[PDB]
Paper text:
To show that the conclusions drawn from the unphosphorylated structure are also valid for the physiologically relevant, phosphorylated complex, we solved the structure of phosphorylated CheA3P1 in complex with CheY6. Since the rapid rate of phosphotransfer between CheA3P1-P and CheY6 does not allow crystallization of the wild-type, phosphorylated complex, we formed a stable, complex by introducing two substitutions, D56N and S83A, in the active site of CheY6. These substitutions have previously been shown to abolish phosphotransfer from CheA3P1-P. The structure was solved to 2.8 Å by molecular replacement using the unphosphorylated structure as model. The structure shows clear additional density adjacent to Nε2 of His51 of CheA3P1 in agreement with phosphorylation of this residue. Due to the moderate resolution of the analysis, residues 60–65, 85–97, and 111–121 on CheY6 could not be traced and were not included in the final model. Compared to the unphosphorylated complex, CheA3P1-P undergoes a rigid body translation of 2.1 Å relative to the RR. This realignment of CheA3P1-P positions the phosphorylated His51 closer to the phosphoacceptor on CheY6, Asp56. The phosphorylated His51 is facing away from the active site of CheY6; however, a 180° flip of this side chain would put it in near linear geometry and place the phosphoryl group within 4.5 Å of Asp56 of CheY6. The orientation of the phosphorylated His51 seen in the crystal structure is likely caused by the lack of a divalent cation in the metal binding site of the RR leading to electrostatic repulsion from the CheY6 active site. Consistent with this, we find very little change in the total buried surface area between the phosphorylated (605 Å2) and unphosphorylated (530 Å2) structures of CheA3P1 complexed with CheY6.
Residue numbers in the entry:
A (entry chain B): 1 to 59, 66 to 84, 98 to 110, 122 to 134
B (entry chain A): 8 to 135
Write the structure that this text describes.
Amino acid sequence: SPYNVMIVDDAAMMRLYIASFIKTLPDFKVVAQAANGQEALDKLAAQPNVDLILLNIEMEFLRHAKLKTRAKICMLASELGADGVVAKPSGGELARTMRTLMAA
Amino acid sequence: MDEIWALYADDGAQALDAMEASLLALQAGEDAAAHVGPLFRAVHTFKGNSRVLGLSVVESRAHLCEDLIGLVRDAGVPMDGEIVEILLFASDTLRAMLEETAASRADVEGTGSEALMDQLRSKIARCS
């Protein structure tokens, strides 16, 4: 703690909203933000200390990522592969499932 | 919060410009196959950003567009001139909605977009 987190989503607005929420969390910290699959690989290659990856459904990457890092992958939706699944926030629930994945 | 709304105005414009470009290309004389996907992603991005800031009215108007496009993509309904026409009117309505919500930093009343919601609902029922 603080756990190093990476945001993966094609919309910059969504990445910033998640980054703003993690900024308020004392047990989690954002280390990388990526728009595409290839961008997510470049950021992951720069930081090996990444603990959790918050991946969006559509922008393949999950295949390459697991061979690079042991980090827990979590899906975001507005099933198979990732460890857990959280619904995209709307202006709390994410904080619970982020903590449960790191504890196990 | 100032950067979040600035990003909403930016991403919103980038998605709507792409939404308009695909519909205008279909109107010019291009196959649906190459344009059905690009605009679903454009509408899916715009609906997602509005849902995040709690712009319920903007999210609802974008959602019906997604359903009509979804009927073309998933259900296999032909994207006739009428589908393109309603979605082009939706593009201009959502453009006025995006510009208003960005300047006010709050949702729209949606009284002036009630005709479009029924226009979309009319076709969705007619296709189903």
